[PDB]
């Protein structure tokens, strides 16, 4: 959306591979400059936490994302 300057909302998770492919087709020159990420929650799920991270890194981050974060 910042590279091929498409409308906000025009591209969704449902239509992403198609959009990026059509963009590569239109402008491969700049699409080459279009750095991307390789991410799947599966991997995210199987990302082990060393040490005491489960208490002071995972649970603490998740409590901040909750409302009334100080009561949790």
């Amino acid at each position: 959306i910042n590279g091929f300057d498409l409308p906000e909302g025009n591209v969704t998770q449902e239509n992403f591979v198609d959009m990026q492919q059509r963009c590569n087709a239109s402008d491969p020159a700049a699409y080459a400059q279009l750095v991307f990420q390789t991410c799947d929650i599966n991997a995210f799920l199987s990302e082990a936490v060393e040490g005491t991270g489960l208490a002071f890194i995972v649970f603490t981050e998740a409590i901040t994302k909750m409302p009334l974060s100080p009561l949790w």
Partner: protein, 711 residues
């Protein structure tokens, strides 16, 4: 049948037409020779009577469908009379169209541009703006003239041009044509001839094909001019970018002729100027005209009519007599061939005499054709004839045998490179301009270019085909194309392109008959009957035969080839390549004279609003420009204590996209040249960023002012 009744009709029409036409032509000639109120009505009445006559006979022509008319001669004349044209348009529609045309013409002619400093001094295009665009070497002054012209007159033409397009298409569609573009491509269209047939669409293909073959030469010319213009305008031109449109030596960049002072290959070397020899040998207008006559007779062309010598403004009225003075050949009719021009003792006038007399020769040659078939094969044939005449006459060889250039002199190849560039500035320089303009009009008329993309594609095509960039971004409120005469005055333009090609094809063919051994750029067809014969073969044809056939008459081909044009500039080409060895031959269609201080701005309504996210329209943009102007004012009045009246018009936006991204730069309140430096603009934004975000219910994140960041 039928054919017989069509013929008798045409015959009676032709006779009556000629005599009644003589009057019209003569009447106008008399007014062109003497400007009296009496002489106005004289031609006015004649004109009406003449036009009326034709109109009636046009209706009576329909009575003979060509489907049954086999003789081409009758067929041609009949179809040249069966044309209904704007008569097909409804009275109201026709009147509306006529009014638009008059308005557009009036705006172009009477539109003035006042100086920002003194509003009392308002320059019109004809003298003030043209002299600045042709002489003024001030980036600021030129930018003012160019921008001011499009901003004042170009907007006034935008709505008119839109209606014009609609009405024009309707008329042509009703005249059995795809669009007004197709209507205009009908000139070169040939049917019912064995191998000489030519489609209206074919023209497009041919023009584009030929254009691709010239591109290389033009790219070298462009690169050379760019390099020189970089010296004339330092810190203004990118050595890899396009050329600012306000620096091309004229208002539109149609010709690059006025860039010669800045691009002369060998400043130390002058060019042949036998005007002094003319005055020294007392060369009066009559003398120079006889030299023209001599030249034509030398190539075996019929002697100038005694009548010509008798009745012809070959010199300035001289007395109080008020007579217009534009070099013009007149076929008054009934064997009447006159030339009207305020001739002077000048090399230019000498060559102009040859050019004008060239047209007379063509007229005389086709004068024996059917009244309606007395014209150049196409719209680019007649002018090309005149051009090749001036070409042969200009050659130092010619002048040295005309007794003006002491033959003891030796033509310097440096002076030849000098001459060749000067010609390239006029000839090659107009080719992309002409091509791109007609392409744009064709696409517009056929609807390819929508109204919302008229200016968008105009500047895209300019940057890509011509390699010319706009110094200021122009939105769909502008009509830059309409700012040119031909566009605002409903005239075709492809004539110029085609003529140029034809001219070179003709010159080459004729010189081959003249048995030229040297560079074609220095060829004199004088004293060659063979060249004259080929020329005459086409000359006498007129419209009787297809233009494809007339081409075969001289060049031997049926289509326009650019090879001879390239051959003519081949010496220059080789030279340019050497000069452009170190230089980058080509341009990038991304560099703009305003990109440097342009701030990119991305807007994320849905990111900050989601639901109830208003649609960004022109009104939201208007608001944005207003907000920026507010910021600029505050910044200046606070940091600089300067009360600068910045308006939404000073905020110049470009590259607007559906991601709600765009580029903007700020200029001085009444100074297009004075661009507020990005640094100041960034500071102004920083100062009021909150306020701007508030106005659009956005935040630094959503209102991404690329280059400005919170801290």
């Amino acid at each position: 049948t039928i054919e017989e009744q069509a013929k008798t009709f045409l015959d009676k029409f032709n006779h009556e037409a000629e005599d009644l036409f003589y009057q019209s032509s003569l009447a106008s000639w008399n007014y062109n020779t003497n400007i009296t109120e009496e002489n106005v009505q004289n031609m006015n009445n004649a004109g009406d009577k003449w036009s009326a006559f034709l109109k009636e006979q046009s209706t009576l022509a329909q009575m003979y469908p060509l489907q049954e008319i086999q003789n081409l001669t009758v067929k041609l004349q009949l179809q040249a009379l069966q044309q209904n044209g704007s008569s097909v348009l409804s009275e109201d529609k026709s009147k509306r169209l006529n009014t638009i045309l008059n308005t557009m013409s009036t705006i172009y002619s009477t539109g003035k541009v006042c100086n920002p400093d003194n509003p009392q001094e308002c320059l019109l295009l004809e003298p003030g703006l043209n002299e600045i665009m042709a002489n003024s070497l001030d980036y600021n002054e030129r930018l003012w003239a160019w921008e001011s012209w499009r901003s004042e007159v170009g907007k006034q033409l935008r709505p008119l041009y839109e209606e014009y397009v609609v009405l024009k298409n309707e008329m042509a569609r009703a005249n059995h044509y795809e669009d007004y573009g197709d209507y205009w491509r009908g000139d070169y269209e040939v049917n019912g001839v064995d191998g000489y047939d030519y489609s209206r669409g074919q023209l497009i293909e041919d023009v584009e094909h030929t254009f691709e073959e010239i591109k290389p030469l033009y790219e070298h010319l462009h690169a050379y001019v760019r390099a020189k213009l970089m010296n004339a305008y330092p810190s203004y031109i990118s050595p890899i970018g396009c050329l600012p449109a306000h620096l091309l030596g004229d208002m539109w960049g149609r010709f690059w002729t006025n860039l010669y002072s800045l691009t002369v290959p060998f400043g130390q070397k002058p060019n042949i100027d036998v005007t002094d020899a003319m005055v020294d040998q007392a060369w009066d207008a009559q003398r120079i005209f006889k030299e023209a006559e001599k030249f034509f007779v030398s190539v075996g062309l019929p002697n100038m009519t005694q009548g010509f010598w008798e009745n012809s403004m070959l010199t300035d009225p001289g007395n109080v007599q008020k007579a217009v003075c534009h070099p013009t050949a007149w076929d008054l009719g009934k064997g009447d061939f006159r030339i009207l021009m305020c001739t002077k003792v000048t090399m230019d006038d000498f060559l102009t005499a040859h050019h004008e007399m060239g047209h007379i020769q063509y007229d005389m040659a086709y004068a024996a054709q059917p009244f309606l078939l007395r014209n150049g094969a196409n719209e680019g044939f007649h002018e090309a004839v005149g051009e090749i005449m001036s070409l042969s006459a200009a050659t130092p060889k010619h002048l040295k045998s005309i007794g003006l250039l002491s033959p003891d002199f030796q033509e310097d190849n440096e002076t030849e490179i000098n001459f060749l560039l000067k010609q390239a500035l006029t000839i090659v320089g107009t080719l992309p301009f002409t091509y791109m303009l007609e392409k744009w009009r064709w696409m517009v008329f056929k609807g390819e270019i929508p109204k919302d993309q008229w200016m968008k594609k105009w500047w895209e095509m300019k940057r890509e085909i011509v390699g010319v960039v706009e110094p200021v971004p122009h939105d769909e409120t502008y009509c830059d194309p309409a700012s040119l005469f031909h566009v605002s005055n409903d005239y075709s333009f492809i004539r110029y392109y085609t003529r140029t090609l034809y001219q070179f094809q003709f010159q080459e063919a004729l010189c081959q008959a003249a048995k030229h051994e040297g560079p074609l750029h220095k060829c004199d067809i004088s004293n060659s009957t063979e060249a004259g014969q080929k020329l005459f073969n086409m000359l006498r044809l007129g419209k009787s035969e297809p233009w494809t056939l007339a081409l075969e008459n001289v060049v031997g081909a049926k289509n326009m080839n650019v090879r001879p044009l390239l051959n003519y500039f081949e010496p220059l080409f080789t030279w340019l390549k050497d000069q452009n060895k170190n230089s980058f031959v080509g341009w990038s269609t991304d560099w703009s004279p305003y990109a440097d201080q342009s701030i990119k701005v991305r807007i994320s309504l849905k990111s900050a609003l989601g639901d109830k996210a208003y649609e960004w329209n022109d009104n939201e943009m208007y608001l944005f420009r207003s907000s920026v102007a507010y910021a600029m004012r505050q910044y200046f009045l606070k940091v600089k204590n300067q009360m600068i009246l910045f308006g939404e018009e000073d905020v110049r936006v470009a590259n607007l996209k559906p991601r709600i991204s765009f580029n903007f730069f700020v200029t001085a309140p009444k100074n297009v040249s004075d661009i507020i430096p990005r640094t100041e603009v960034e500071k102004a934004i920083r100062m009021s960023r909150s306020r701007i975000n508030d106005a659009f219910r956005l935040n630094d994140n959503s209102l991404e002012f690329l280059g400005i960041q919170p801290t």
